[PDB]
Structure 1
């Protein structure tokens, strides 16, 4: 009848790059641009994260009264598809999750994240 079998359970991001922040920054930037470009229809929630993190990685979680979800440039941060929706209150939410994560630790996940949306199949 049939003699086949499918199975694939493994996920080990790049470590030879993770270490190097340069290659991580190059990816982080591209990842962001990719979003701004509007080529990868990432989940609103996801894209939200990136933004929230961007601000974080941008300045840092070492703020609250100054760092506002408005001051941000969702227009120069999120793609039109989002601009229209104007998901601000959403951004903040992400930050809440981030909390006070390292600027690098955030950048790392960022690349991975952007590397999570684009799946192969």
Structure 2
């Protein structure tokens, strides 16, 4: 019990505070299990819109949306599923998503033909660097940490040079340039 719960709490919080970017629909799937866990099977009597504080069931970037109807619907989808069997599922849904176990940063990429930068999620692990869609969350690109030649940072930018001719560099708008530079560095020197 105690071990299963450490992981559940870990996965949960990393989602509620937005450390693990997930797409709406899933946040509500999670919330669904979160209700099964904290309340027990659904009760179409008590469990109706307004019966929940959505600030402690979802990523700040969805509390607004008001998908309280989505959560109870997913809640309902758990029948009489145990508090434990739900914790499990939630932890398997948390791992099945690529964004799982990555350390993102919000970056602003300049896309050709449009002066208007398009917010993006930058992901980094001890093995790769991925490009993740701000809203949808679906990765768009992926690079091996071992193909990183050098990086650079400034109080308002970050750039990664793989040494890939055609593509060139990957520069972005960021205030976290010195932290994203620190991470990678730590990782790289662990991986020869």
- When the two structures are superposed, what TM-score results if normalisation uses the length of structure 2? 0.48
Give the 3 Å change call, closer, same or farther, for CA 42–69 of structure 1 in structure 2: same
The answer to whether the Cα contact below 8 Å between 1:51 and 1:78 also exists between their aligned partners in 2 is yes
- Structure holding more helix per residue: 1
Count of residue pairs brought into register by the alignment? 100
The answer to whether the Cα contact below 8 Å between 1:49 and 1:94 also exists between their aligned partners in 2 is yes
Query: Displacement, 1:38?
Result: 0.6
Q: Matched residues in 2 for 1:78 and 1:62: separation?
A: 18
Query: Structure 2: 5+ residue runs without aligned partners?
Result: 101-192
Query: Displacement, 1:69?
Result: 4.1
Query: Structure 1: 5+ residue runs without aligned partners?
Result: 1-20
Cα deviation, 1:42-101, whole Å, max 9, x if unaligned, reads 121111111111111112006331233421111121111111212111111101221221
- Tell which deviates more after alignment, 111-120 or 56-65: 111-120
- When the two structures are superposed, what TM-score results if normalisation uses the length of structure 1? 0.73
Query: Displacement, 1:119?
Result: 5.5
- Which protein has greater RCO, CA pairs closer than 8 Å, 6+ apart? 1
Query: Displacement, 1:33?
Result: 0.6
RMSD: 1.8
The answer to whether the Cα contact below 8 Å between 1:69 and 1:91 also exists between their aligned partners in 2 is no
